[PDB]
Amino acid sequence: PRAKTGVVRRRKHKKILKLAKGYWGLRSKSFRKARETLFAAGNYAYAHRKRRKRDFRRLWIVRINAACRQHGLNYSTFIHGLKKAGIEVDRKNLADLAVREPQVFAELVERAKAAQ
Amino acid sequence: AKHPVPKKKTSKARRDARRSHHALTPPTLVPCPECKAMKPPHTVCPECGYYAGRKVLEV
Amino acid sequence: MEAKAIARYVRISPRKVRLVVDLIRGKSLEEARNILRYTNKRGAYFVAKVLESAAANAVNNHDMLEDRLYVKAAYVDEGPALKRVLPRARGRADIIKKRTSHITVILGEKHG
């Protein structure tokens, strides 16, 4: 018996092009240029997921620093302060505290200085 | 010469962008004082054959 | 209500008729006529035919009034191309594409 291509290749090509919606020029119309685009698209997603974890922790650290210097110490002093104090509130929360509950952040500064 | 050639195919964006100057100016038209039909200024009116307020040719 | 006409298989290059059609889209049937009569373009003659045909359709078939007609929609599609041989030097044959057009004009009624 003969098994001609028939229906198979079109369906595989359509799977790519649907994932490729939004791309520029042929990168969303040509199956070849979509597939190439997605190779890079998939590796960027893997890499930037790892990087997002670093991106946000950077933002928190910068935000913690500015709230810290208002009370006259720098991030590196505050963080070593909380280490001796036993305080384990993390940077994602220290930053939301720094912005939303400054009265609570201010006490954390005092525990940091006092515990040196 | 050494037969110059295009190096890449021109994208639909660059092609149509070159045509951004290709639209037609609609013809300049004014009403004829005698028959009120619209026609280009400074020509004998092809509908009534009037120019400068007088008959000038048969139509 | 809308009246449409379609001139299929006009032997003219789609890109060329479009220039003339772009002059009249959204214009009223009266301005569209004067504009077409003094357009210095082969494509003017074909558009005018389709325009007057669509206007006849409006009045005659669809109970619309001539005084209130405007060109609500118009567009030129590409039809099957006539392929012809153009001889060049050194024994080579080039294929001229004598392109073809499907001209469409849709008139509506500009009430008020």
Place this chain on the structure above:
Amino acid sequence: MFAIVKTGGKQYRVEPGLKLRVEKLDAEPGATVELPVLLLGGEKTVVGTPVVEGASVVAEVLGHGRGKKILVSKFKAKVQYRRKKGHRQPYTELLIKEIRG
């Protein structure tokens, strides 16, 4: 009146009423679990070092789900290396009932 609780190796600020998704707890739906408190705030400040002794946060387990599907794709050029993996992170939905202290 909020509490900073720790569950699933991560830290969250929570208030009575707040719906929150965390890592998968081993706990039947509609059950109740207590969360460890690291800081209390609002009408009074209590700073765990690290955990506040008396405190806890009472949570209702609405359900257990699987998140939207992330496509984990890998590509090494000029080496015919290609990997497609579909991932869904299992989670647990909680309703913050009250903040004991």
Place this chain on the structure above:
Amino acid sequence: PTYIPRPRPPHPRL
């Protein structure tokens, strides 16, 4: 494929 136009001779790079 009617007539095969022979290609120009290269520049002598000797």
Place this chain on the structure above:
Amino acid sequence: MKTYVPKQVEPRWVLIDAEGKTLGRLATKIATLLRGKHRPDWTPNVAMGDFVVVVNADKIRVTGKKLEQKIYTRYSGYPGGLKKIPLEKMLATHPERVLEHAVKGMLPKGPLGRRLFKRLKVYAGPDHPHQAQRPEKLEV
């Protein structure tokens, strides 16, 4: 919980007296004010920093022999179009450009980095025209 992203706040104008300050160690601080990195709600993708007015830029100070030896360059894009202008000259002609140039090179490159530079008003001499904004004098 998602990280807090502030809504648009009206910016605070500040005023620095550069008389006697070291060019580079001041530019650092103006840069940071312009990025707004003194604010606990700092956000990297929006212009949310301060407006920074500087006076007495003519009286900026520099160490070593930099007055004679520091060279600013502009390349015109024409052959031989490299111009070299030394510090002495640049103070004697467009003194505000000394501090302008130093900070601009301590700002990000790109669309947002360029907007931040727009929010810096350096003047030679002790006066500035922004009295309408009532700037808040700073000590740095």
Place this chain on the structure above:
Amino acid sequence: RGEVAYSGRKIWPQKHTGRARHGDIGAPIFVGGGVVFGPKPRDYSYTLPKKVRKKGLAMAVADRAREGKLLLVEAFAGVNGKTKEFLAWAKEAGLDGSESVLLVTGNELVRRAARNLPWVVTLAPEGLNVYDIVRTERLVMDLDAWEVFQNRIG
């Protein structure tokens, strides 16, 4: 590509045409060219060990008997060639056409009767085969055809 109708002429020169190189248009890279590893007439048969065919035959009948679906009949009473005569007999022996029957008998007349029933495969004892015993639900044999079956698995 050797059995195809085209000529063996190289279609254009090997070099300097600016085109890919080819030989004749019979090559399987061309539309209308030959087929690279297409079928050719094959003999799919093979000699299965006789003892495998004797054990299988016995075993197929054994399966039916262990189900209580094997039924030996001494003879077919009214069946003289007519289909209505076999149905009549069928109902008497409990065969009501809700089960596939393999009627195994050397009676030329009885096989004519039961030929056309969509629920009866008809067969002579010499043709007893396991594929037909297994594709049917019940088995029915002469005492004459059963004697013949006993020979073959001896």
Place this chain on the structure above:
RNA sequence: GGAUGACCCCAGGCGGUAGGGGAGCGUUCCCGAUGCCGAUGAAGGCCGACCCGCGAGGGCGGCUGGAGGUAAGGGAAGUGC
């Protein structure tokens, strides 16, 4: 652990070219089939932000289409660009 994949627990391994090995998906065709799905809509097409699967894929729903299609379990290859 229980009793020989029935699932649970604990621990460890899991970058990868040439290449070895293992498990699967889908295509055409045969048995299953004198059956079963089918104009209250076959195959094919076009959408889907839904369901299952690590994936290849499979469902289901809407539109289009207008007459075929074919299960569990197996069999054979002109089987995937």
Place this chain on the structure above:
RNA sequence: GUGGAGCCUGGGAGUGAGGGCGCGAGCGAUAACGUCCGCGUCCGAGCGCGGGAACAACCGAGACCGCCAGCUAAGGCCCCC
């Protein structure tokens, strides 16, 4: 010393253009991103990740998947960062 250790029989291979570096030599000129051996390493196949402005083989370190959590490595903590 229980390790993707070892040994034996057998099925399937691919490879038989290497390259940088450290050290020991020859050749070279106590030249070469030079050449030819030895010991080791990495790239090859880790053009995946951090650092080194950028950069296969230098320093850090062997990426099963997810996390808007924590500790470090080399290198860093005036601003770009």
Place this chain on the structure above:
RNA sequence: CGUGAGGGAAAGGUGAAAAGAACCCCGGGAGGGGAGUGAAAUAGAGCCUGAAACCGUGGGCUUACAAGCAGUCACGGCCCCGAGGGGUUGUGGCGUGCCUAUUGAAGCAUGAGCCGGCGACUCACGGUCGUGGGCGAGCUUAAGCCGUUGAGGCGGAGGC
């Protein structure tokens, strides 16, 4: 096409039935718009289904101080669907196409305009391991012959 020997294509499908669109309107015609036939007319003869590249009309978001393998991650705005989702992308982060050949390529080394379809590890007989079964000091038949008409059996020559 070739002087010639010779080479050598492309091109199938309305509908159950022509009922294959009288007649009227614009038009030189072509083509269309009504009317009519049909279950269906984007089945209208350039006719089943009608994919993709490719061209166009309309709508939503967006873009004229901006540095780019075109994506990805984050936030914000606008539009849509109705503690959420879809579309778009302004700013910020990161980021050297695919294949091939190579010690080493984004590589200024090869190939590819783009899309659809054709397109490359097979068959036969022998061998050598492995494996699922049958039989076991034994195992097995070939050509034929009888039967069947998708029925199987006989045949011991011969081979190991």
